[PDB]
Amino acid sequence: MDYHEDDKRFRREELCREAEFLKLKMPTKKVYHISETRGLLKTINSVLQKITDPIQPKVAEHRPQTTKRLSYPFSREKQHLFDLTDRDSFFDSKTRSTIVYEILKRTTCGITSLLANGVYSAAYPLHDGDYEGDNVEFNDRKLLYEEWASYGVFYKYQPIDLVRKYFGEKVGLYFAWLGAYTQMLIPASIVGVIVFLYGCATVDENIPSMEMCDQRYNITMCPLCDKTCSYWKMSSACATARASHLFDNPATVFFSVFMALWAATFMEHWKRKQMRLNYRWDLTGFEEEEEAVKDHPRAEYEARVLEKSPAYFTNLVSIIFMIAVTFAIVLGVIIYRISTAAALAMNSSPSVRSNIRVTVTATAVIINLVVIALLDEVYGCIARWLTKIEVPKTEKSFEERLTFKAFLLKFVNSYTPIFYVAFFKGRFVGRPGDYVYIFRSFRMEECAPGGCLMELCIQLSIIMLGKQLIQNNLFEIGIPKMKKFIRYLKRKQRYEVDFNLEPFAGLTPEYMEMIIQFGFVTLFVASFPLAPLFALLNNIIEIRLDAKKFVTELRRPVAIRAKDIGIWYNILRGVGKLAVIINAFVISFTSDFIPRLVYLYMYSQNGTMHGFVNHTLSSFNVSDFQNGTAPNDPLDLGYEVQICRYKDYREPPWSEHKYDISKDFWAVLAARLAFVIVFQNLVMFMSDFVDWVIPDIPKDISQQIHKEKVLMVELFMR
Amino acid sequence: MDYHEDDKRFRREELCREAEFLKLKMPTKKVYHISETRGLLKTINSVLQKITDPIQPKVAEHRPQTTKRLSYPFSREKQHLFDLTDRDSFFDSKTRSTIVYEILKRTTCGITSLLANGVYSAAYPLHDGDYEGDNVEFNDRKLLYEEWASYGVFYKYQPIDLVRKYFGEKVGLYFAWLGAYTQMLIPASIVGVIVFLYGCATVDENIPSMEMCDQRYNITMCPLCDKTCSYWKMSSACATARASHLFDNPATVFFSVFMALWAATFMEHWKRKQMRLNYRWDLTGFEEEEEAVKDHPRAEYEARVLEKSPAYFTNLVSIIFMIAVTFAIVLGVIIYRISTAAALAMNSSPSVRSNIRVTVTATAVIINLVVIALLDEVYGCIARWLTKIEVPKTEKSFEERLTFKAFLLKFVNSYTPIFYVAFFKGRFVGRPGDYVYIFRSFRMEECAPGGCLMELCIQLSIIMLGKQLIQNNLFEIGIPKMKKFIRYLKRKQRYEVDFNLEPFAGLTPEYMEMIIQFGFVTLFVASFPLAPLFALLNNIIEIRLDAKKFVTELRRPVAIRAKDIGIWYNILRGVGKLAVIINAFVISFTSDFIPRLVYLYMYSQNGTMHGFVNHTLSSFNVSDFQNGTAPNDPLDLGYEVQICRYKDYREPPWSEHKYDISKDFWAVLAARLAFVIVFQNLVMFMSDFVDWVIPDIPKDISQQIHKEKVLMVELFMR
Ligand SMILES: [Ca+2]
Ligand SMILES: [Ca+2]
Ligand SMILES: [Ca+2]
Ligand SMILES: [Ca+2]
């Protein structure tokens, strides 16, 4: 008895009298083409539509889409707009749904203001067919859930054509983009594990690792705490140092070059795939501007200046946005400063002494992650509020400005931890003699023994494991399900089952999360190789997970059309242009690559290197400490202390210069900047060259569109 | 008696019998629409055409151009393709000429192969009307020569519409581009002379100039020659040093930032002007691909592999092109090395002693300029030959590849003088103790006293004066005129007068020369401000000069159509992207800006600077010379010599280190690279931001194209 319907509405069964008055007035506008029909239920009833056929011809030449034809060149039919195809039973419920949605948009108060009132609840099309049923008559939703949206069929491809024709163009483009993303993430991940195993095959045969773990030399160290620690041996940090060697060999620079070139070729390959996709569907997705009705506060402000009687308002909301994002980055760095106070002075009062010193930084990044998720929530909501106060012109413009503001907020708050740990961790602290004070209090911030890269490597590694594979996937699969179970604490028609499903929130969260992952996996690959492995695993989970989400825990979308990806290809190009200038900085300002090379070239006095640590570790006469800055226990853990060493490129204390800037500091900084210059310029040239040499329209469409134009112009005479 | 004609041909009046046989066969193809007519003359006769009217309707819907309409919105008529306008006497001779040229192209052997044979000479349309006559009946060529192409009307604008409608789209776009170029060159030139007068207003009040010209201190100098000179005083070079101060103040960095931002906004403004221009003419210049007949050796090679039975050939001609351009840059630097041997050892044997030392470098750049003009000729001819051996597909592809190869050749051979003088002049010579030998002969190359910038400044200044204002303009106005006078050593119908005029050589020389000038005036503005002044003068001459050239000493062009500028906007964007990375290098590696700033910041021990020269001038004990490297006359010109000074950032000889690399050398190199990094990254961001924030379609076309589409769709019903 379930007939052929389209795009139900909501009636609010028992101001409310004004609400039902307009909810009966506007259906007189809505029966200008199609008479409605209503429904019955137990909670609250609703309205419904039954389109008759020629109305879709009445708007089809008014909304010209290139539907199917009768002819075919080479066993692949061509497409034309609307004339004399006349099959009369060949439309699709996606097309019929977006047509009747267009008609619902056509009414004027419009339907958007009606939804903003509360006279309705939601007006969304109905899903055709119950998935995973007992005897269900092969509808495309159930077939798609069977063969696309469960993890057993993760190994085979994605049915792009059917997911488009059932969900519309936007979700089809998004999932085809995720498919191209994973398939281009495959070879970069394979070369990533190749360079990782190169690191493991030279985890021993490199020299400074052995020079660090060679015992009996009793290489002491300055305490790197204000007062609550003592001197110690570098060979106690040799484990983390040998671990750090794994990521910064002279092959990780090749890996970084490969990943930047990979971002370039992925961008070009996705342009080509999207062009072929738009060929395989509607030949253009071009629609005439101002198709949407102008937004409600636009016309309200029009009437306001009509009763009142500008250029300052966009600029003032832009500068207050700049103040917002600057307070956001400062709040990110101060919340990382707070996260450095995870367990301050556990030695003195608690004295539990778990003796790991990898669990404390893990606790720090854990509390940073939970507070930054909360700040993501606050920034998203207040950014949506601010873009509402924007009063933008159209929904395309409002949506673009909103997603730009929200991506800038999310990007800065979820990247300034890693940026701060890379380039502002110990670059600012003074020498062992004197330390810079934070609001005249004490030492600012100092980082772990055995390289300052490994802290960032572990933080980024477990941010990529946790907040992508585990945390975000599990909360996305759980939180709407848990809201459903909360309501579940509190026959079955297709409207009746479609009411309880979750409303749609757009494509912005999936785009935003995947672009955050892209920002990781092309901004911080040089210090941390095998980021494409975790991005591959998250994507393998994510495509089928969000497929299952769409087909099970989501109401039917409205199936809008847009041949462009959106703002997100521009944001991808932006992150790809930022990738080289941050990879250069991470190689030349965190890794031990460039000092290793400059010591191999200049001060070697031999073929290969030896005593590199014995070269960089400048000493410090312990008589020259400041008052109070002495360690509380010169315990003589090993040999003895008379001096302490530290690798800050300074002169020895016995020189007439005491602890000033030595020359080799200027030498290594010169070589560092020389590498940044040559790296950035050369590989930026190589990126723009591999974008020039790649055609953006391949040799299979470039002739074929003209060939079907030949077929059209030869048929069109008579 | 001069009736209404179109596009004459050439008949070769008395193999030759085969020549006249095909020259009678193909006119049977050519009378498929239009019967010909012939002519009589004294030297050698010709053929001619008289189009009848409806043939242009017969190809007009076949070649759809948006001609004029009958209606108008807002006193500006709209345009439509070809239906029911029916004025029957409204075509233009430009349109009729390109139509009959299209018909001449339509014949198959085609007309291009016929011109390649020699059976013809040339087939070009006729100019309508003799310019500057006594009683001439107001034809557009004479009017255009009166009011556009003579230097008295240089002060007013350019008539873009009429020069298009008389010459076609390509020359119209070119001259409108030159107009936009000059009009956007105006404000950059004004700010250039502002920063120049700032330099003149601080030519005295800066400190190191006074510290150089302060006498009685007897600041000696190392000889900077192998053997044939002596020591000397820096105050003898203080004149050129005070001149050098004029160009490298801390305001020339602002000027360089302004010029790079100017290149960005000129690019955007020219995109906007070209878009508005294409609105003001044909709404699209889009034509269906493969409109041209495939090239002759393409089909010949098709038949060759048809009788013979690839991917290697494009790659082998590309690598041989790379070998060609590498030999070109090496030949440029070796010809500058030869040009350094202008007058070697004039002191010893000739002893004329003109005592200028500005005339010798002028002679060097003069001989470099004449030999590089000869090399331009050789490279252009052999590059045309190589692109013929390319066997390209179409004339668009062949022309693009040819102009790319020729521009790369011309650009490298006419820029490696300035690049070599900037960044490879004295950066490679050793210390005064030991010098690097060129093929174990003697000292490589050393540059002038009083800064090494001023040599480049004078060389670039007089290359911009001579080889743009004087030499190229005078040879372009002279050489075809002189060939005409050579033939002049050896009634008057329009064909009869049109035969003796010069054939057309395309737009590539004017584009190429103007892009070379752009490359100067945005690649080397930082060292040499007021390059926009000379570019403004050359352009003010050049627009009216080439206008006069077109309308007087040039046959009528064929008036092809293309809505794009061509490859030249891409080449402009390329030079604009190279501009920042070469301006950064010229500021931080030739100027005295960044060492001035690093001495102002670090080693000052005072507020402002003093003894900057006394800081950089490291000394040299004269006992430590090599054998033979001593000067031939320790003449004691002034005080006395016991040591010689030189500004190469080395330690004094009395240190236990003798003449090694000092620390402050590493310091200033670090600061240099830091400035290159911050400059390049910041202003590249500012360029891409000022390209983002500028819309590429203004608010006067964006609505108006849709408004005339509204008019078209409202008229088109009935
Ligand atoms: Ca997730
Ligand atoms: Ca997700
Ligand atoms: Ca010239
Ligand atoms: Ca010229």
Numbering used by the authors:
A (entry chain B), B (entry chain A): 117 to 130, 165 to 259, 267 to 466, 488 to 668, 683 to 910
Please give sentences taken from the publication describing this entry.
Calcium-activated chloride channels (CACC) facilitate transmembrane anion conduction in response to the increase of the intracellular Ca2+ concentration. The most prominent CACC is formed by TMEM16A, which is expressed in different tissues of the human body. Structures of both functional branches have revealed the general architecture of the family. These proteins form homodimers with subunits containing ten membrane-spanning segments. Our study reveals the location of a hydrophobic gate at the intracellular entry to the neck that controls ion conduction in TMEM16A thereby contributing to the tight regulation of its open probability.
To characterize the structural relationship between residues constituting the gate and address how their mutation to alanine stabilizes the open state, we studied WT and the mutant I551A by cryo-EM. We next investigated the structure of the constitutively active mutant I551A in the presence of Ca2+. Although at a lower resolution of 4.1 Å, the general correspondence of the mutant structure to WT emphasizes their equivalent properties in the Ca2+-bound state. Whereas the mutant resembles WT in the Ca2+-bound state, the Ca2+-free structure of I551A exhibits pronounced differences compared to the corresponding structure of WT. Sidechain truncation of any of the three residues by mutation to alanine causes a strong increase in the potency of Ca2+ and results in pronounced basal activity.
